[PDB]
Each structure stands twice: as C-alpha cells, then as structure tokens.
Design a protein around this ligand. Structure first.
Ligand SMILES: O=C(O)c1ccc(-c2nn(C(=O)c3c(Cl)cccc3C(F)(F)F)c3ccc(Cl)cc23)cc1
Ligand SMILES: O=C(O)c1ccc(-c2nn(C(=O)c3c(Cl)cccc3C(F)(F)F)c3ccc(Cl)cc23)cc1
Lengths: 261, 261
C-alpha cells in the first residue's frame, strides 16, 4: 500500500472507533488524572452499597463478590456488541464468508475486551459504569475465595500495557489487527483475512512511527503484547471452569444464563 | 536506534555464532529431508519392528519410555548448545548473573521447539543427528500419555515452517527469544530490553532484506511466540503427570532445575 492509503485506513478506523466505543482512552485518562464531575469511588463494602443507591449501577440488578463478578459479565456482553459494530467498519470485513466473520469475533472479542479494559485502569483501580464509578484495585483484591484473584491479572497486564502510552488512534488499528487473525480455529478462507491484516499491520506500523517517532520498536513491542493477551484469555477460561464446578450461588434465571453464555 | 551497517554487522555476528554453536542446521536438515542424496539418506522408523532394526543400524525398558527419555537426553544437549550461543549475544554475559540464569531457564524450551521445527515435515522428524527419521504416525501411536507429547510440536512446526525462514533468520529470532524482559523474577528488566530492541531492529532489517516479497513476515514471526508459550505449558503439564505415574523414571539435573517453577 501507498503511504496515503495507510493514513486513510488509519483515519477511517479512528473515526469508527470513536463512534463505536463511548468511553475512549482520552476521556478515561481525563477522569483518572483529575483534569475535567468526579467519579464515585468504591473502596469497601459500604461505599459499594451507597454507589448502588446513588448511581444505580446497571451491573447490579446474592453475595457481593458474586454480584461483582456477574456485573463484569454483563459489561462484557455489552462490549461484545460495540466491538461487533466496530468490526463491520473494517474494510473487507463484511465481504468475508459469514461463518468466518462469526469465527473471528468469537475468538477475538476477549482479547479486545482486555485491551480496552486497560484504557480504564491505572495501578490503583478501574473505571466502571461508563466512567461514573471507580472501583479500587485493593477492594477487588479483597473479595473472598476465587473472586479475589479475578481482576488482578488484568491490572498487571494493564500497568505494563499502558506504559506503552498508546492513544485511541493507535488502539483503533491495533484492535482491528486482533480481529483479523488468520490463525483462528475453523476458518474457511484464511487468505482474504490475512490480506486485510497485512494492510492493517502496515497501517499500524506507519501510525506508530509517525505518532511515536522516539519510541524504538514500539511496533514489535505492541505485537509481543498479543502473547500477554492470549495468556490472560486462557487463564480467564480456567477461572470460569473452576467457578462453575465450585459455586452454586452463581446460577441465575435460566434466560440470564443463556444471555451470558 | 542503530545504523543499517551496524544492524547487518549484528546479524552477521549472530549467524556466525549460530553456525558454530548448532551442528545440525536447518539447511543441513532440509537437504537430508529433500533427497537426491544417496549419502545422506536416513533409516525410517514407522512401527515397532522397524524401530528394532533401527537400534542395530542407527544406534532394558519399554519403548514409549525409551523414546521419551531419548528426547530428554537430546533436550539436555540442546540446552548446552543454546547456552553456548547465548554467551555470544552482545551484552548477554554482561548482565546480572541471576538474570542470565532466568533468561535461559524460561528461554531454552521455546528455542528447542523453534529449532525442532527445522527437523520436521508433516510426516515425521529427523533424529540421531539426522541419521534416523521417525514418522509422526508411529509417535502418535505410543501408549498412555506418550502418544500425544510430540503432536503439538508437529502442528506448530507445520505452521512455523510455512514462514520459510532460513538459519540466518533463525539466528536473530532465537536471540530475541532469550532476551525477553518479561520473564518472571528478572531483577534488571531495562538492560535486557535494550538488547532485545537492537535484536528486533536487526531481525526486522534481516527479514526485509532476505524475504523482500514476504509481506509483514516480521510481524507474523513475532506472533509465533504465542504458539511457543502454549507448547511449553502443555509439556509442563505432561511432566507433572509422568512424575505422579512413572516412578521408575528419572530426569537430568539440568532439566529438573529448568522445570522447577
Ligand atoms: O474478566 C473478564 O472477562 C472481564 C472483566 C471485566 C470487564 C469489564 N468491566 N468493565 C467495567 O468497567 C465494569 C462496569 Cl462498566 C460495570 C460494572 C463492573 C465493571 C467491572 F467490574 F468489570 F470492571 C468494562 C468496561 C469496558 C470493557 Cl471493554 C470491559 C469491561 C470485561 C471482562
Ligand atoms: O517434549 C519435549 O520437550 C521434546 C521432545 C523432543 C525433543 C527432541 N527430540 N529430538 C530427537 O532427535 C528425538 C530422539 Cl533423539 C529420539 C526420539 C524422538 C526424537 C524426536 F522426535 F523428538 F525428534 C530432538 C532433536 C533436536 C532437538 Cl533441538 C530437539 C529434539 C526435544 C524436546
């Protein structure tokens, strides 16, 4: 591709990423610094209750640790629909075989979720409820039984990922790259998938060089983070299997289980 | 950053050391696997009967166990060769001693499976310095847990070999693997990442110059480190299983210490 076509691709994805994801990294950072309506902090059991009364968190219609877990599931399901709409804007994506589109999203949404969750994290906690709340890392770590170690791997990824200091215009391309992974199981026609990823990778490379000229081999260092994402996804699955085998206060309305499957 | 002439000098240095440190190169392995070589033809082991003649021609346990111990013995020799190659990487021996050990502890197996790919095609693997060739089917047919220990390596090899790297490419890539700042327990991450930055720069230039028509080969190679990580994980699980089930069986001290955590 030509240099002007790569910038065009970059600007297109950035615009689409803005339309598809309400809470962008730039907005989340403003909130987390102290540079903008300040968020409601949840740092213990009592300030959780108060936050449910005042903000009426949609991830709270049980036991506290359970309700919080389930609330992350509710938000993940929301994120899936935002990512799915974003995918449709990727040039070439809707022209792929429909089963392949489903297959790419099925395996890619989780890597994307955690990529974008880092945008809402710092070393001390995570923004929730479209940025109206802030749940502290220490309050998450203090949840009983297996729920106390559910978010901590995400935080540890987030601190290292954020050190790369990507902005939304970088991330928009990076997210596209994740979706167009030709190595997903069951793909029927890998060749146009990798053709698109090649254009996205080229565009990501030029974008990082233009936007971070002083950050040597940021492109490679970003690609290596896809190892850290895949590992986090595998560990998450491990935690679910353990939860389903051990916790019985998990079951909800059967219709709820189907929504959250 | 570095100058082009410095990056070519680094690539030339590593390829030279790679030749000196690893007797059985990919180029040698492929010449043996292709043919038109009456002098280089291996003895082919495809069932229990041909294994017995192979003991006589190629040179008190059970077959599945002998085979598995064999691979462990050859993994030890590989660690030796990889260690010798690591000392040649500029900056490596200057690092904190504990970190050198940590980089090798977590690095060697990802390198073993990388270089094992060089000895493989979809139908089998060269053994005994290329004197033998063991079919993938005969390996898959081994009893108990040992029937599945090589198959993940084959599946990786098939996809890794599709990149068509040669030894000079692999010399830099192996260097990048060793100098991973993200290994657990590293004391001084920063001087490790400075080296890997120079190695990444050198690898990128090398791949562009050597495979000018292979678009984004650099990025595609970096994504292979996820497959490496997962093969290692699955091997670790198999060892824990063998330790609880095969009390006869012993391990080289070198491998025992690598495996500890
Ligand atoms: O491990 C997973 O599978 C997982 C975990 C969390 C999210 C996740 N949460 N989130 C919240 O901010 C949130 C909200 Cl909005 C309301 C209530 C609670 C939460 C929170 F506790 F989970 F944090 C997100 C916002 C954006 C995106 Cl992309 C992802 C998330 C996803 C997956
Ligand atoms: O699971 C692991 O961790 C593992 C497995 C195999 C090797 C391994 N074997 N090998 C053999 O030649 C061999 C022998 Cl000697 C006898 C029988 C079978 C084999 C072969 F099928 F595995 F190939 C190698 C040669 C070079 C290198 Cl670098 C690695 C190996 C290492 C680790």
């Amino acid at each position: 591709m030509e240099s002007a076509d790569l910038r065009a691709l970059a600007k297109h994805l950035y615009d689409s990423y803005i339309k598809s994801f309400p809470l962008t990294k730039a907005k989340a950072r403003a909130i987390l610094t102290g540079k903008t309506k300040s968020p409601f902090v949840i740092y213990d059991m009592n300030s959780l209750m108060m936050g449910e009364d005042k903000i009426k968190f949609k991830h709270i219609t049980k036991e506290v640790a359970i309700r919080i877990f389930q609330g992350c599931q509710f938000r993940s399901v929301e994120a899936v629909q935002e990512i799915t709409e974003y995918a449709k804007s990727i040039p070439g994506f809707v022209n792929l075989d429909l089963n392949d589109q489903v297959t790419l999203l099925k395996y890619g949404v989780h890597e994307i979720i955690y990529t974008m969750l880092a945008s809402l994290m710092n070393k001390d906690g995570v923004l929730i409820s479209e940025g109206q709340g802030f749940m502290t890392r220490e309050f998450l770590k203090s949840l009983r039984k297996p729920f106390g170690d559910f978010m901590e791997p995400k935080f540890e990824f987030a601190v290292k990922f954020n050190a790369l200091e990507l902005d939304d215009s970088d991330l928009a391309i990076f997210i596209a790259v994740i979706i167009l992974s030709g190595d997903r199981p069951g793909l029927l026609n890998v060749k146009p998938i990798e053709d698109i990823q090649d254009n996205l990778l080229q565009a990501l490379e030029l974008q990082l060089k233009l936007n971070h000229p002083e950050s040597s081999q940021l492109f490679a260092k970003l690609l290596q983070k896809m190892t850290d994402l895949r590992q986090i996804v595998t560990e998450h699955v491990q935690l679910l299997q353990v939860i389903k085998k051990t916790e019985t206060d998990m079951s909800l309305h059967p219709l709820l289980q189907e929504i959250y499957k």
